[PDB]
Coordinates of C-alpha atoms in Angstrom, one line a residue:
Chain A
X1 CA 83.4 93.1 76.0
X2 CA 82.3 95.5 78.8
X3 CA 85.4 96.9 80.5
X4 CA 86.5 99.7 82.7
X5 CA 90.3 100.0 82.9
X6 CA 92.1 102.1 85.4
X7 CA 95.5 103.8 85.5
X8 CA 98.5 102.2 87.2
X9 CA 99.7 102.4 90.8
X10 CA 100.7 105.9 91.8
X11 CA 103.2 107.3 94.4
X12 CA 102.2 110.8 95.7
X13 CA 104.1 112.9 98.2
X14 CA 102.0 114.3 101.0
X15 CA 100.3 117.6 100.3
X16 CA 100.1 116.7 96.6
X17 CA 97.5 115.8 94.1
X18 CA 96.6 112.7 91.9
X19 CA 94.6 112.4 88.7
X20 CA 93.6 108.8 88.3
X21 CA 91.7 107.8 85.1
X22 CA 89.2 105.0 84.3
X23 CA 88.6 104.4 80.6
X24 CA 85.5 102.6 79.5
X25 CA 84.6 100.4 76.5
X26 CA 81.9 98.0 75.4
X27 CA 79.1 100.4 76.1
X28 CA 77.6 103.8 75.8
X29 CA 79.8 106.0 77.9
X30 CA 77.2 108.8 78.2
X31 CA 74.3 106.7 79.4
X32 CA 75.8 105.2 82.5
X33 CA 76.9 106.8 85.8
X34 CA 80.5 106.6 86.9
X35 CA 81.0 106.0 90.7
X36 CA 84.3 106.0 92.5
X37 CA 85.0 104.1 95.8
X38 CA 88.2 103.7 97.7
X39 CA 89.4 101.2 100.3
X40 CA 92.0 102.3 102.8
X41 CA 94.1 99.3 104.1
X42 CA 92.1 97.7 106.9
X43 CA 88.9 99.8 106.5
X44 CA 86.2 98.6 104.2
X45 CA 84.9 100.5 101.2
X46 CA 84.1 104.2 101.3
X47 CA 81.9 105.9 98.6
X48 CA 83.7 108.9 97.1
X49 CA 81.7 110.5 94.3
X50 CA 79.8 110.0 91.1
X51 CA 79.4 111.6 87.7
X52 CA 77.0 111.3 84.8
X53 CA 79.3 111.6 81.7
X54 CA 76.5 112.7 79.4
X55 CA 75.2 115.6 81.5
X56 CA 78.5 116.1 83.4
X57 CA 76.4 115.7 86.6
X58 CA 78.9 115.2 89.4
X59 CA 77.6 114.3 92.8
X60 CA 79.8 114.0 95.9
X61 CA 79.6 113.2 99.5
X62 CA 80.1 116.0 102.2
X63 CA 83.5 114.5 103.1
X64 CA 85.2 114.7 99.7
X65 CA 83.3 117.7 98.4
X66 CA 86.3 119.9 98.1
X67 CA 89.1 117.4 97.5
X68 CA 87.7 115.1 94.9
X69 CA 86.8 116.5 91.5
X70 CA 85.6 114.2 88.7
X71 CA 85.7 115.2 85.1
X72 CA 84.7 113.2 82.0
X73 CA 86.1 113.2 78.6
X74 CA 83.2 112.3 76.3
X75 CA 85.5 111.9 73.3
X76 CA 88.0 109.5 74.9
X77 CA 85.5 107.6 77.2
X78 CA 87.6 108.4 80.2
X79 CA 86.5 109.7 83.6
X80 CA 89.1 111.4 85.8
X81 CA 89.4 111.6 89.6
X82 CA 91.4 114.6 90.9
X83 CA 92.4 114.3 94.5
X84 CA 94.2 117.1 96.2
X85 CA 95.6 117.8 99.7
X86 CA 97.0 114.2 99.8
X87 CA 97.4 112.7 103.3
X88 CA 98.8 109.4 104.6
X89 CA 95.3 108.2 105.2
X90 CA 94.5 108.7 101.6
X91 CA 96.7 105.7 100.8
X92 CA 94.2 103.2 99.4
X93 CA 93.0 101.4 96.3
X94 CA 90.7 103.6 94.3
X95 CA 88.1 101.7 92.1
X96 CA 85.5 102.9 89.6
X97 CA 82.2 101.1 88.8
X98 CA 79.5 102.0 86.3
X99 CA 75.8 102.2 87.2
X100 CA 72.4 103.0 85.8
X101 CA 70.1 103.5 88.8
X102 CA 69.6 102.4 92.4
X103 CA 68.2 99.3 91.0
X104 CA 71.1 98.7 88.7
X105 CA 74.6 100.0 89.7
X106 CA 78.0 98.6 90.6
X107 CA 77.8 95.7 88.2
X108 CA 81.1 96.2 86.3
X109 CA 84.1 97.3 88.2
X110 CA 87.6 98.5 87.3
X111 CA 90.7 96.7 88.7
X112 CA 91.6 99.5 91.2
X113 CA 94.6 101.7 91.0
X114 CA 96.6 101.8 94.2
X115 CA 97.8 105.2 95.5
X116 CA 100.6 105.5 98.1
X117 CA 101.2 108.9 99.8
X118 CA 111.9 105.9 96.7
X119 CA 114.3 102.9 97.1
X120 CA 114.7 100.4 94.2
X121 CA 115.1 96.7 94.9
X122 CA 118.2 94.6 95.3
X123 CA 117.9 91.3 93.4
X124 CA 119.8 88.2 94.5
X125 CA 119.9 85.0 92.5
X126 CA 119.0 81.8 94.4
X127 CA 120.8 78.8 93.0
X128 CA 119.5 75.3 94.0
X129 CA 121.8 75.0 97.0
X130 CA 121.2 71.3 97.3
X131 CA 123.0 70.4 94.1
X132 CA 121.6 66.8 94.4
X133 CA 118.7 67.2 91.9
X134 CA 115.3 66.6 93.5
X135 CA 114.2 64.8 90.4
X136 CA 114.0 65.5 86.6
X137 CA 113.2 69.1 87.7
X138 CA 115.4 71.7 89.4
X139 CA 114.2 75.1 90.7
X140 CA 115.8 78.5 90.6
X141 CA 114.5 81.5 92.5
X142 CA 115.1 85.3 92.7
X143 CA 115.1 87.3 95.9
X144 CA 113.9 90.9 95.3
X145 CA 115.0 92.5 98.6
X146 CA 114.3 95.8 100.3
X147 CA 112.4 98.0 98.0
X148 CA 109.8 100.9 98.1
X149 CA 107.2 101.5 97.0
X150 CA 105.0 98.6 95.6
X151 CA 105.2 97.1 93.2
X152 CA 107.8 95.3 91.2
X153 CA 107.4 93.1 88.2
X154 CA 109.4 89.9 88.1
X155 CA 109.8 88.0 84.9
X156 CA 111.8 85.0 83.8
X157 CA 113.8 85.0 80.6
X158 CA 111.9 88.2 79.7
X159 CA 108.7 86.2 79.4
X160 CA 110.1 83.2 77.4
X161 CA 109.9 81.2 80.6
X162 CA 106.3 81.4 81.8
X163 CA 105.7 77.8 82.7
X164 CA 105.8 77.1 86.4
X165 CA 106.7 80.6 87.6
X166 CA 105.7 81.3 91.2
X167 CA 105.9 84.9 92.3
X168 CA 105.0 85.0 96.0
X169 CA 103.4 87.8 98.0
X170 CA 105.7 90.5 99.4
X171 CA 106.5 90.9 103.1
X172 CA 107.0 94.3 104.8
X173 CA 109.6 95.3 107.4
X174 CA 110.5 98.9 108.4
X175 CA 108.8 100.4 105.3
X176 CA 110.7 98.2 102.9
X177 CA 109.3 95.2 101.1
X178 CA 111.0 92.0 100.0
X179 CA 109.5 89.3 97.7
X180 CA 110.5 86.0 96.2
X181 CA 110.0 84.4 92.8
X182 CA 110.8 81.0 91.4
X183 CA 110.7 79.0 88.2
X184 CA 111.1 75.2 87.7
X185 CA 113.3 74.3 84.8
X186 CA 113.7 70.7 83.8
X187 CA 117.3 69.6 84.8
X188 CA 118.6 69.2 81.3
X189 CA 118.1 72.9 80.5
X190 CA 120.1 74.5 83.3
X191 CA 123.0 75.5 83.6
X192 CA 123.5 74.4 79.9
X193 CA 121.2 77.3 79.1
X194 CA 121.3 80.8 80.7
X195 CA 118.4 81.6 83.0
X196 CA 117.7 85.3 83.9
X197 CA 115.3 86.8 86.3
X198 CA 114.1 90.3 85.3
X199 CA 112.8 92.6 88.0
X200 CA 111.4 96.1 87.2
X201 CA 110.5 98.8 89.8
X202 CA 108.3 101.3 88.0
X203 CA 108.5 103.8 90.8
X204 CA 112.2 104.3 90.4
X205 CA 112.5 103.5 86.7
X206 CA 115.0 100.7 87.3
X207 CA 115.2 97.3 85.8
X208 CA 117.6 94.5 86.8
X209 CA 118.1 91.2 84.9
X210 CA 120.0 88.9 87.2
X211 CA 121.7 85.9 85.5
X212 CA 121.1 83.1 88.0
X213 CA 124.2 80.9 88.0
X214 CA 125.2 77.9 90.3
Chain B
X1 CA 74.7 108.0 108.4
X2 CA 74.6 104.5 109.8
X3 CA 76.6 101.3 110.3
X4 CA 76.2 98.2 108.1
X5 CA 77.1 94.9 109.7
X6 CA 77.8 91.4 108.3
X7 CA 78.9 88.1 109.9
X8 CA 82.7 88.2 109.7
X9 CA 83.0 84.6 108.4
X10 CA 80.6 81.9 107.3
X11 CA 81.9 78.4 106.5
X12 CA 80.1 75.8 104.3
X13 CA 80.5 72.6 102.3
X14 CA 80.1 72.5 98.5
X15 CA 76.4 72.2 97.5
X16 CA 75.1 73.6 100.8
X17 CA 72.7 76.5 101.0
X18 CA 74.1 79.4 103.0
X19 CA 72.5 82.8 103.8
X20 CA 74.4 86.0 104.2
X21 CA 72.5 88.6 106.2
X22 CA 73.2 92.3 106.5
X23 CA 71.7 95.0 108.7
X24 CA 72.0 98.6 109.7
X25 CA 72.3 100.8 112.7
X26 CA 69.5 103.0 111.3
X27 CA 67.0 100.3 111.9
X28 CA 65.0 98.1 109.5
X29 CA 66.1 97.7 105.9
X30 CA 63.3 98.3 103.4
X31 CA 63.4 98.5 99.6
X32 CA 64.3 102.2 99.7
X33 CA 67.8 100.9 100.8
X34 CA 68.5 99.4 97.4
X35 CA 70.8 96.7 98.9
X36 CA 73.7 95.8 96.5
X37 CA 75.6 92.5 96.8
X38 CA 79.2 92.8 95.6
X39 CA 81.4 89.7 95.5
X40 CA 85.1 90.4 96.0
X41 CA 87.8 88.1 94.9
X42 CA 91.6 88.3 95.4
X43 CA 93.4 91.4 94.2
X44 CA 90.4 93.7 94.5
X45 CA 88.4 91.7 92.0
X46 CA 84.9 93.0 92.4
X47 CA 81.8 91.5 90.7
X48 CA 78.3 92.8 91.2
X49 CA 75.8 90.1 92.1
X50 CA 72.5 91.7 93.4
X51 CA 71.3 95.3 93.3
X52 CA 68.1 97.1 94.3
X53 CA 67.6 94.3 96.9
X54 CA 67.1 91.3 94.5
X55 CA 68.0 92.2 90.9
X56 CA 70.6 89.8 89.7
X57 CA 73.4 91.5 87.7
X58 CA 74.0 90.8 84.0
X59 CA 75.2 87.2 83.8
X60 CA 75.2 85.7 87.3
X61 CA 74.1 82.1 88.0
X62 CA 70.7 82.1 89.5
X63 CA 71.9 80.3 92.7
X64 CA 72.5 83.9 93.9
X65 CA 69.2 85.4 95.0
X66 CA 68.7 88.6 97.0
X67 CA 65.9 89.0 99.4
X68 CA 64.8 90.9 102.5
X69 CA 64.5 88.8 105.7
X70 CA 62.8 90.6 108.5
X71 CA 64.7 93.8 108.9
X72 CA 67.8 92.5 107.3
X73 CA 68.8 91.9 103.7
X74 CA 70.0 88.4 102.6
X75 CA 72.1 87.0 99.8
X76 CA 71.3 83.3 99.3
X77 CA 73.7 80.9 97.7
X78 CA 71.9 77.6 97.1
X79 CA 74.3 75.0 95.8
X80 CA 77.6 76.7 96.6
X81 CA 80.1 75.8 93.8
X82 CA 83.6 75.8 95.3
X83 CA 84.3 78.9 93.2
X84 CA 81.9 80.9 95.5
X85 CA 84.6 81.2 98.0
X86 CA 85.1 85.0 98.3
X87 CA 84.0 88.0 100.2
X88 CA 80.4 89.3 100.0
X89 CA 79.8 93.0 100.8
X90 CA 76.3 94.5 101.2
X91 CA 76.0 98.2 100.3
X92 CA 73.0 100.2 101.5
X93 CA 71.9 103.5 100.1
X94 CA 71.7 106.2 102.8
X95 CA 70.4 109.2 100.8
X96 CA 73.1 110.8 98.6
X97 CA 75.6 107.9 99.1
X98 CA 76.2 104.2 99.7
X99 CA 77.4 102.7 103.0
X100 CA 79.3 99.4 102.7
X101 CA 79.3 96.4 105.1
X102 CA 82.7 95.2 106.2
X103 CA 82.4 91.9 104.3
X104 CA 81.6 88.2 104.8
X105 CA 84.5 85.8 104.0
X106 CA 82.5 82.7 102.9
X107 CA 84.7 79.6 103.1
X108 CA 83.4 76.6 101.0
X109 CA 92.7 68.9 100.9
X110 CA 96.5 68.5 100.5
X111 CA 99.8 68.4 102.3
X112 CA 102.5 71.1 101.7
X113 CA 105.9 70.9 99.8
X114 CA 108.7 72.8 101.5
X115 CA 111.5 74.4 99.4
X116 CA 114.6 75.8 101.2
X117 CA 117.2 78.1 99.6
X118 CA 120.6 79.0 101.3
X119 CA 121.5 82.8 101.2
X120 CA 123.0 84.2 98.0
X121 CA 126.7 84.9 97.9
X122 CA 126.3 88.6 97.0
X123 CA 124.1 89.0 100.1
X124 CA 126.5 87.2 102.5
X125 CA 129.1 89.6 101.2
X126 CA 126.9 92.4 102.6
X127 CA 127.2 90.8 106.1
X128 CA 123.6 89.6 105.7
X129 CA 121.9 86.3 104.8
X130 CA 118.2 85.5 104.1
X131 CA 117.1 81.9 104.1
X132 CA 114.0 81.5 101.9
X133 CA 111.5 78.6 102.6
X134 CA 108.8 78.4 99.9
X135 CA 105.7 76.4 100.8
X136 CA 103.7 75.0 97.9
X137 CA 100.7 72.8 97.2
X138 CA 98.8 73.1 100.5
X139 CA 95.0 73.1 100.9
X140 CA 93.2 74.6 102.8
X141 CA 95.5 77.6 102.7
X142 CA 96.2 77.8 106.4
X143 CA 99.7 77.0 107.8
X144 CA 101.9 77.9 110.7
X145 CA 105.5 78.1 109.6
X146 CA 108.1 78.1 112.4
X147 CA 111.9 77.9 112.1
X148 CA 114.6 76.1 114.0
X149 CA 118.3 76.5 114.2
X150 CA 120.3 73.4 115.5
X151 CA 116.9 72.2 116.6
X152 CA 116.3 75.2 118.8
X153 CA 113.2 77.3 117.7
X154 CA 113.9 80.8 116.4
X155 CA 111.6 83.7 117.0
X156 CA 113.0 87.0 115.9
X157 CA 113.8 87.4 112.2
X158 CA 111.2 85.2 110.6
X159 CA 108.9 86.9 108.1
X160 CA 106.0 84.8 106.7
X161 CA 103.6 86.0 104.0
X162 CA 99.9 85.5 103.5
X163 CA 98.7 82.4 101.8
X164 CA 98.0 83.1 98.1
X165 CA 95.5 80.9 96.3
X166 CA 97.4 79.6 93.2
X167 CA 94.9 79.3 90.3
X168 CA 94.9 75.5 90.9
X169 CA 92.7 75.8 94.0
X170 CA 95.7 75.2 96.2
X171 CA 97.8 77.7 98.1
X172 CA 101.4 78.9 98.4
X173 CA 103.3 81.2 100.8
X174 CA 106.9 82.2 101.6
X175 CA 108.7 82.6 104.9
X176 CA 112.1 84.3 105.4
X177 CA 114.6 84.1 108.2
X178 CA 116.8 87.2 108.1
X179 CA 120.2 86.4 109.6
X180 CA 123.7 87.9 109.5
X181 CA 126.6 86.6 107.4
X182 CA 128.0 85.6 110.8
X183 CA 125.0 83.7 112.2
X184 CA 124.5 81.7 109.0
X185 CA 128.0 80.2 109.1
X186 CA 127.8 80.0 112.9
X187 CA 125.3 77.2 113.0
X188 CA 124.9 73.6 112.1
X189 CA 121.4 73.3 110.6
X190 CA 118.5 75.6 109.7
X191 CA 115.1 74.0 109.7
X192 CA 111.9 75.4 108.1
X193 CA 108.9 73.8 109.8
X194 CA 105.3 74.1 108.7
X195 CA 102.3 72.8 110.5
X196 CA 99.2 72.0 108.5
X197 CA 96.1 70.2 109.8
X198 CA 97.7 68.5 112.8
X199 CA 100.7 67.1 110.9
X200 CA 104.1 68.7 110.6
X201 CA 106.5 68.8 107.7
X202 CA 110.0 70.1 108.0
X203 CA 113.0 70.4 105.7
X204 CA 116.6 71.6 106.7
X205 CA 119.9 72.7 105.3
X206 CA 123.5 73.3 106.6

């Protein structure tokens, strides 16, 4: 029942500002401290700042003093992290954790909201190829090629088909990602039935439902 | 400020008792360092284990005990359940802020299934062609996927991803060989080879 939920992935242009949010539930918002940490790509965690929602006691580190500004909305249970003068090296996953004291802190953590300081994907349907059914099961795939930025959200039959869906990790080449997804449908069902692969790219506001045909 | 250091990787068998140390560049680690042990799981899944040097977090199996060993801190896992495979970070309080260790990837079988897909038609039409080889069901997640055209190894063009642990305590990954409409048609076969634990597995298409 204790949960800290953070905003979704953000895409910020350089020299810009981001206001992430971390809403809390399952506990007294104004009795626990709110700490923020970030993890640039291959760097290890860095402590950013902290705020006591009850008192509005915000304590930073010398480094982020002027660029990070935490605010708390006592009514909505949300703590906000403003970040200005965005640089490439700011690209990282920002996380929030609650705490009580140096003896008890960083027990419950958010999920992390990724910030990246816009090209939609090109989806290609992958039909079996080897038409000689491997067994009672046949597998279709969807190639989500050349997109930016992360992420995309692949779905099969708009969620109807959730059994045996394997969405693999993206690869990167020249600032463009590409990723694969698959779903194993029992022979009988396809192509007798229509199988669609839905791909959404939040950052560009595009959605593509590709009917995968043989 | 200082530099916290942890052993990059500690391997162990289920049930064993392993000890993760953590030290600083400042010197000896006392109680006024309030060491915190954070367990990180895939996708930035953080879970607090110990805090204040040895205070178990709310709801964490007692096999996780924090303690000071000499001038270093120490997270002790006695009876490592397979599920304890993750990264362990020690954070040290250096007046006014925390300083995090890099992490300790604690590592507490099965042969792979290869799945090849020939390029899509709409992609060939764009003078391009990506062969997708999806590797499923391997454990431990550690493979070396190579490609071969006509039996001759290919080097440039292959893009292989990091092994993701499917919930099933097994892994999966995906390699790609980006070719041109021309090259695809130009050859006889295309082989996706994967090497796992001394033994190779390969699947091809024409």
